Amino acid sequence: GENPSASNQLIQKKYVSWRDAADEANTQVAAHEAEIKEETLRQPGVVAAQQALDKANAIVGHDHEQAVKRAQEDYNTAYNEAYNTVRNRYIQVLQQKYIEAAKAQGNYYDETAVEANRTNEQRIADDIKAQTGKDVTVTKDENGNYVVKDEKGNVVATVDKDGKTVKADAKAG
Numbered sequence: 001g002e003n004p005s006a007s008n009q010l011i012q013k014k015y016v017s018w019r020d021a022a023d024e025a026n027t028q029v030a031a032h033e034a035e036i037k038e039e040t041l042r043q044p045g046v047v048a049a050q051q052a053l054d055k056a057n058a059i060v061g062h063d064h065e066q067a068v069k070r071a072q073e074d075y076n077t078a079y080n081e082a083y084n085t086v087r088n089r090y091i092q093v094l095q096q097k098y099i100e101a102a103k104a105q106g107n108y109y110d111e112t113a114v115e116a117n118r119t120n121e122q123r124i125a126d127d128i129k130a131q132t133g134k135d136v137t138v139t140k141d142e143n144g145n146y147v148v149k150d151e152k153g154n155v156v157a158t159v160d161k162d163g164k165t166v167k168a169d170a171k172a173g
Contacts, residue, residue, distance in 0.1 A: 001118050002099065003111040006126055013129040016122045017137040022088075024108040025095035029087055036090050040082035049075035121146050124163040131166045132157075 001020040040046040056071040103113035111117035148157035157167040165173040
């Protein structure tokens, strides 16, 4: 949906979710997700955590576990969380490269490559801000329903075929 015929896909209200860009690329990168995190272990920023873990781990005695509890956890977590971190960034990296490839694959729906910028679902994303005002996401689930997910990661509402149906405004169905 890269074409601001209604949304630049990075705008407040009347907006098609960035998920168009992200989630499609995300499914791709996840096929090789482990390699993504691996870049973090060679990343000048994250490596410093490993480096510091050894320093904290060098503490001997019962103070060892006490010291490392706070410190080593953060480092250990840094690399693990980095899978998400670097993946989210990798979304940006792979997406732009895959976008031009997507045209031949008909993968995601785009008006500057494949077909149109927004599908009904993506259109609903735009309408949702007209409906409630919140800049949230919409996705067609397994059953074919358009689930409205808040950026917290939880589906707060659901829209039906009408594309305006919302469990908050005066549109039930």
